[PDB]
Structures are given as structure tokens and as C-alpha cells.
Design a protein around this nucleic acid. Structure first.
Ligand SMILES: [Mg+2]
Length: 758
RNA sequence: UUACUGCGCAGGUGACGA
DNA sequence: TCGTCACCTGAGCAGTAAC
């Protein structure tokens, strides 16, 4: 067993002589870093200023002399390494600092892609795609108790349209509504100027503007987004444009794919190693071996968790390693107890889509047949219901109507339901042009609002989805059917876990930031989800209707304390029973929040039981990546020479970075989509230092199980449902807070068991 | 807004300290 | 009020759906 990292060992001196002096006000640090520039590295920490002489010659410095040892206090050399790595690469210019980030000098993938697919155009040479390397010096533990410093290498692509705006007009590219950014930017200033309304003389007209309502064509380029790229190129190349993207895709894979990335990291290391890195003029550092995660000798830095089982009965007999293979065979987890076996479902659609909807509904309810083995049985027989009655609600509305769409939908729903009687759920079909209208006239959010107020949960769908070719539709209907069943109060599947303790609660927090435009300032909302341990199973609990970011810390403990009281009454804990509480979020909580949570929970359950509490954070966007060299990968498809997910660690691999931090692999070769897919990056799982429960390996495995618990999809989610579901609830409820005639009254009455947020 | 995955860009934000 | 280490969020395009 061995997993290789994207980092290199850094040999540092055992000791270093530093000059220190008390400096309670950090305000004076910036001026001193300038005064001593060139001769001293300077660093502020815990009320004191530290000075490392990096070059002989004055000026001089006062204070106590102390020997800072690397093994004990690695943070000083780690910080110094940020600057020293830059100085060691003078022919590479820093596009950003800490981490030190720079670009490849020779390579440019659009040029190479033009040659490879054989395309040619004038302005093509003004669309630049340049590899981007970052070097992050990070502290890690080979074994518990000992800390070292490693330099980790990450690669990205810099997309940039330096083409002038006057050129893109004359070539027939419509610039109306494209975002625009500055060329020179600009001691700490903003880049985003605004959107393009039209161009005057040597002047652009900006709506949704960040500052001024206009700028010179010279002081403004398009932002290097996919959107802007695809929009420009397609107008300059179509239909030969798709040929360029496949070509560009091949080039990028030349840096992103496992073997390629491993190679690129290897080559980066040799280059950094080829000379000593001058920490000072007399003090040297040196890049060593590629850092590994292994169980070699005293080290215990890698394990593979078992496969996640999907469970479809209360005992645990019926199970599978995939959700859909399991559901097809056994049916949903709660079939025996599922109350409503003849659900009436409202279907709201533009009258002009009648025929296309009927077929989609036919496929959904009654299946696509054995020719399309992804979705054969159809919703009814799949979930083990008697039947599904549709109440058809056509809407006199057209895609071109972008101001009256929402009132037309709501009028039609209102008038339909007035007769009709009670409906248990609804499906709403949307025009592509209506899907992203502002919330004041968006039919998605307004129908959602109306129907959720009335206690009717909805699964919505856009017309391009309804019109998918059969081969895609079958997978679409898998997800559609799973979510709809869950919105009808269903429990499709669970994941295995054998209870070691008498009860286990996991609560998660998710964040949404809402805004009508980029210019407009973003308002923050928060959601809370809960997962319980059961007999052999994890069970999704109740969900918040509380919303605002302010007092989020209070909302957490109220959810926790109220739930703990409910759990204690329900399960009636014995003296000496252990209760565990775990918190998940994408950010760490404050120490004061942890202390407060801990106190309130502890006293609420009382002294009769033992309380274990852990506060976990989950990162997607860190500098670590895992490489498994024993992984040959899988056929890109049955059955070619190309392979996908080469060098990709198995799903469930857990690597030890430190005492509080683990790396979790989630995307196996099986799940990786195609040959050009980059090497996956693992989830970083971090335990808050004030946690009373400590087994982070267990918690990393628990987080993995919770990615399989999502009923949005048949395939696992990117993050555990505790956070993911909470983000969805934060977005919806945040958006609904601005829709008139919205009430949450039914969220814990008619919708109490509905997973309406999927 | 069936989703998953990936990526680009943009905005910044979080925690810890004194 | 600021240093320091860290990485989150939203929008949108494109390819593919775990023996
Ligand atoms: Mg959904």
C-alpha cells in the first residue's frame, strides 16, 4: 500500500538564529518590512516581531537573540520559503503570491490546438491559454509528534482574451452582455468593470457597472471565462469550433491527467532541486524526495475504507454497491411502510409542449422498455406503487414572453387546483429562456413558491431535458424518479453503518449567497440538515426553515439541543450510554462557538450520559492531490485503447497529513467520466482542535458515506449531504424570502417529511 | 431548473492571534 | 485595527450517466 503526493520534502537547517522584539500593534509591521527590505525577512506572530537576516549589511535591529528550531516551530521557515521560492525562480514572474504562482513561458495551448485540429484564423492568436503553476509550502506530519515542511505543486490553466474589442465587433461577434475587465490591474483595485451595452468611439457603454458607466476600449478586455471564449470562437469558427475544443481538451489533458500530472510534478521537482534554495546567503534549503503516504516502518499514513453499501431494508439483507442496481432489484428502502401508493401529480406546462410532455410523462411513469435498460420499469413499478394519476395543467404561455410568464403559470395552477381536489406533488415544465430570468419574473421560483406554500412539493424540468435523446433520457429519469419519490416523503435508500455507540447525531451547515447581479451586494443565508444513526442505517432527519446568516451560531445549538432532547425522550438513554454529535461545514467554527455548542449540548443531555463531540470542516480547494501508481485505469468506453482515471486512488482511500487532517479520495476510475478528465483532487477533512471526539479517520469515512446518501442523484454527491442539502435549502429559502405571497407555514406541516429541497 | 463531473473566470470571505 | 494562513461562493459551458 502506497499513495504518492504532489509535494517534495524540503531539507531545512535544524536551527536558525532570529532577532525578536515585542510589537503589540501590527499596524507598524508594513513600514518595517519596507525599511529592512533586502537584508531581513520579517514575520509577525503572537504579539511579537521576528527578524531573519537574509543578506549581510545594515541597517541593524534591536532585541533578544533566540534559536528557532525547525522541528519545534516550522512556521517561520515555511513563511520564509514562500519568498525564497520566488527568488529562486527569477525568470518566472509571480501572477500571485503565497502561494507563489507563475506561468509557463513557452507553451500556449490554443496555438497547439489550432495546429492539431488543423484550424486557422487571424484573431485565434489573441486567445491565450497558458499553464499555471503554484508552489505551496505546507506543514505536515510524517508520523505523529514530528512536523516537517513540504512544497506542493498544483497546476491550472490561465485563460485570457487579450484581443481588442474593436476587432471582435468587425468579425461578427456580438459583444452585447459580455462581462468586461481591466487590462492594467492595479494596486489592490477591482478588475470587473461591468457588462457591455454598446461601443461608442474609443469608448464602451457599461450596464451593471461596478464603478463608472463607461471606459476606453483600450482599458478594457473581455474576462477570460468559458462563456466569453465559447461565444467568440464559435462565431469565428463554427461548425469547425467543436474541433478546436476537442484539440484544446487534448492539450490540457497533457498537464492534468494522472501520468501527465505526475510527470509534470516530477519535472518541477528536478528543476527546484537542481540548485540550493537560498533561505539566506549563508543558509540553504534543498528539495528532497516526493512525499509519500504509506505504512512503512513507524508511519501509519494510509488506509482504504470499505466500499459503501447501499441498503434497501431494515435488517440489512438487501444491499448493493451502487444505488440504481440496488433500487431496481429490491425497490425503495421504505416500500413496506410508504403510505401514498396512488399519488396524484400536477403537471404544469406550456400548451405548445403538450405532445412532448405526454411522451416524457409516459416514459417517466410507464418506463422506456427493455431497449433502454437505464429506465425500463418506470416510476410506478420501480417504486412499487399502484399507479400515478396526472392532473394536466396546460399554460397559455410562450418562450418569447419574458415579463408575464410567471403570473400566467400561477394563474393556471391556482385555477386548476380550485376544482381538482388535493394533489400530492407537481411537475413543472419550463422554457429554456425562462429558466434564468430575474427572480421577480422567474417561473421556476414563483411556481415553487406557490406550490410549496400550498404544501405541494415540485420536481421541475427544462424543455431541453424533456427533449433529450433516449440514451440520455434514461439516466435523467433515474435521478428525476429518485428525487420525486423523496419529495413524496419516500426513502429510496440508506447507507450501512453498524452502531458502536448508543446514539449518533450529525448536523450540517450550508451557505448561500444571493444577488440579482454581480454588481449587487450578496446577501447570505444558511441551512441546517441532520442525519441520525439507526439500527444498521443512517437516517435523514428534519430540516431547517430558519434562514439568516446573522445568529447562525445560535441556530446551530438550538437545532442541536432541541434534537438531543427529542432523541433522549424517544430512545430513553440508559445511565452510562454514550451520545456522539458531529458537525459538518465547509468552514471551521469559532472557538467561542465550539465552547458554546459544547456547553449547551453537554448540560442538555445531562451528566447521566457520556458526550462525544467533533467539529469537522470539509475542503475541496486545497493544494494536496493523491496519486496511486498501481492504477492502470479503465477503458474510456467498451472497448478502446484509451483509458480514464489513470493513477487515480480508489474511492475510500484515506491519507494522513496531520493529527487533525485527513485526505479523502471520492472519485474512483469507475466514476471518472472520460479519458481527458484530470486527476481527481481529494477532500481534505479537518478536525477542530477543541473537539472531544478525536478519531478523524472515522469521521473521514463518515463523510464518504454521506456523499452516497444524496437523493438528488443516483451517483454520489461531491460533498456530504449534511452540507450539500443545507446549501440547497439556503438557496431556495433565501430566494423565497423575496417572492411575494410566499409562506413557510407548510414546511413542517404538509411538507414535514417531504425532501422538497432536492 | 434530472444530475454527476470537470474547468474557466469573477467576487471576495473565513478562522486564528495580539 | 491589522498580520497571517487559508479557501470559499456564484455563473456558465461541455461531456457523460459507477460491471
Ligand atoms: Mg432537484
Amino acid at each position: 500500500r502506497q499513495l504518492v503526493s504532489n509535494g517534495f520534502e524540503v531539507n531545512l537547517p535544524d536551527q536558525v538564529e532570529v532577532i525578536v522584539r515585542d510589537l503589540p500593534d501590527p499596524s507598524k509591521v508594513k513600514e518595517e518590512r519596507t525599511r529592512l527590505m533586502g537584508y531581513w525577512f520579517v514575520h509577525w506572530f503572537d504579539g511579537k516581531l521576528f527578524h531573519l537576516r537574509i543578506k549581510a549589511g545594515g541597517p541593524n535591529v534591536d532585541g533578544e537573540h533566540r534559536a528557532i528550531r525547525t522541528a519545534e516551530h516550522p512556521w517561520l521557515l515555511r513563511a520564509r520559503l514562500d519568498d525564497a521560492l520566488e527568488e529562486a525562480l527569477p525568470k518566472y514572474a509571480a501572477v500571485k503570491k503565497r502561494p507563489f504562482t507563475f506561468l509557463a513561458q513557452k507553451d500556449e495551448l490554443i496555438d497547439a490546438a489550432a495546429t492539431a485540429a488543423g484550424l486557422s484564423h487571424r484573431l485565434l492568436n489573441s486567445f491565450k491559454v497558458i499553464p499555471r503553476f503554484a508552489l505551496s509550502p505546507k506543514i505536515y506530519e510524517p508520523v505523529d509528534g514530528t512536523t516537517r515542511v513540504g512544497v506542493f505543486v498544483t497546476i491550472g490553466m490561465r485563460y485570457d482574451i487579450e484581443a481588442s474589442l474593436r476587432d471582435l465587433l468587425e468579425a461578427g461577434i456580438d459583444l452585447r452582455g459580455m462581462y468586461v475587465v481591466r487590462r492594467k490591474r492595479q494596486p489592490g483595485e477591482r478588475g470587473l468593470l461591468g457588462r457591455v451595452r454598446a461601443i461608442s468611439d474609443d469608448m464602451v457603454q457599461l450596464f451593471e457597472e461596478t464603478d463608472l458607466a463607461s471606459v476606453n476600449v483600450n482599458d478594457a478586455k473581455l474576462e477570460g471565462s468559458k462563456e466569453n471564449f465559447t461565444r467568440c470562437l464559435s462565431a469565428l469558427l463554427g461548425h469547425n469550433y467543436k474541433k478546436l475544443l476537442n484539440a484544446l481538451d487534448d492539450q490540457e489533458a497533457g498537464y492534468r491527467t494522472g501520468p501527465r500530472f505526475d510527470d509534470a510534478v516530477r519535472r518541477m521537482g528536478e528543476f527546484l532541486a537542481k540548485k540550493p534554495i537560498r533561505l539566506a546567503d549563508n543558509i540553504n534549503a534543498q528539495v528532497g524526495d516526493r512525499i509519500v503516504f504509506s505504512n512503512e516502518g513507524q508511519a501509519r499514513n494510509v488506509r482504504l475504507a470499505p466500499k459503501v453499501e447501499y441498503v434497501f431494508d431494515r435488517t440489512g439483507a438487501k444491499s448493493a454497491e451502487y444505488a440504481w442496481r440496488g433500487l431496481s432489484q429490491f425497490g425503495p428502502f421504505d416500500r413496506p411502510s410508504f403510505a401514498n401508493r396512488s399519488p396524484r401529480i400536477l403537471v404544469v406546462y406550456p400548451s405548445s409542449t403538450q405532445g412532448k410532455v405526454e411522451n416524457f410523462l409516459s416514459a417517466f411513469r410507464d418506463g422506456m422498455g427493455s431497449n433502454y435498460s437505464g429506465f425500463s420499469k418506470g416510476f410506478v413499478d420501480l417504486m412499487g406503487l399502484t399507479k400515478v394519476e396526472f392532473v394536466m395543467c396546460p399554460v397559455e404561455v410562450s418562450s418569447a414572453d419574458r415579463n408575464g410568464a410567471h403570473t400566467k403559470y400561477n394563474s393556471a395552477i391556482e385555477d386548476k387546483l380550485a376544482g381538482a381536489g388535493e394533489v400530492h406533488a407537481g411537475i413543472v415544465v419550463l422554457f429554456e429562456d425562462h429558466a434564468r430570468l430575474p427572480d421577480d419574473r422567474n417561473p421556476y421560483i414563483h411556481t415553487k413558491s406557490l406550490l410549496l406554500t400550498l404544501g405541494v412539493p415540485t420536481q421541475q424540468v427544462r424543455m431541453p431535458t424533456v427533449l433529450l435523446e433516449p440514451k440520455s433520457l434514461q439516466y435523467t429519469l433515474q435521478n428525476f424518479s429518485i428525487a420525486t419519490y423523496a419529495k413524496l416523503n419516500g426513502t429510496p435508500w440508506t447507507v450501512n453503518h453498524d452502531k458502536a455507540i448508543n446514539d449518533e447525531l450529525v448536523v450540517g451547515m450550508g451557505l448561500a449567497e444571493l444577488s440579482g447581479s454581480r454588481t449587487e451586494k450578496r446577501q447570505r443565508f444558511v441551512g441546517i440538515t441532520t442525519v441520525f444513526a439507526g439500527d444498521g442505517s443512517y437516517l435523514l432527519g428534519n430540516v431547517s426553515k430558519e434562514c439568516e446568516y446573522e445568529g447562525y451560531s445560535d441556530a446551530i445549538r438550538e437545532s442541536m439541543t432541541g434534537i438531543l432532547r427529542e432523541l433522549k425522550k424517544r430512545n430513553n438513554w440508559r445511565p452510562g450510554d454514550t451520545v456522539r454529535v458531529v458537525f459538518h461545514a465547509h468552514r471551521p467554527l469559532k472557538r467561542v462557538d465550539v465552547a458554546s455548542i459544547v456547553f449547551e449540548c453537554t448540560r442538555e443531555i445531562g451528566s447521566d450520559q457520556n458526550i462525544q463531540m467533533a467539529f469537522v470542516t470539509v475542503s475541496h480547494d486545497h493544494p494536496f492531490v493523491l496519486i496511486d501508481r498501481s492504477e492502470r485505469g479503465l477503458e474510456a468506453y467498451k472497448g478502446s485503447t484509451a483509458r480514464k482515471g489513470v493513477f487515480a486512488p480508489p474511492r475510500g482511500a484515506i491519507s494522513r497529513v496531520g493529527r487533525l487532517t485527513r485526505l479523502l479520495a471520492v472519485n474512483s476510475p469507475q466514476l471518472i467520466k472520460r479519458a481527458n478528465t484530470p486527476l481527481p483532487t481529494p477532500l481534505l477533512v479537518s478536525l477542530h482542535p477543541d473537539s472531544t471526539f478525536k478519531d478523524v479517520d472515522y469521521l473521514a469515512e463518515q463523510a464518504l458515506k454521506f456523499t452516497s446518501l444524496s437523493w438528488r442523484s443516483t451517483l454520489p454527491a461531491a460533498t456530504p449531504v449534511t452540507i450539500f442539502y443545507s446549501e440547497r435549502i439556503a438557496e431556495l429559502l433565501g430566494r423565497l424570502k423575496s417572492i411575494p405571497n410566499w409562506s413557510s407555514a407548510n414546511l413542517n406541516i404538509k411538507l414535514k417529511w417531504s425532501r422538497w429541497f432536492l
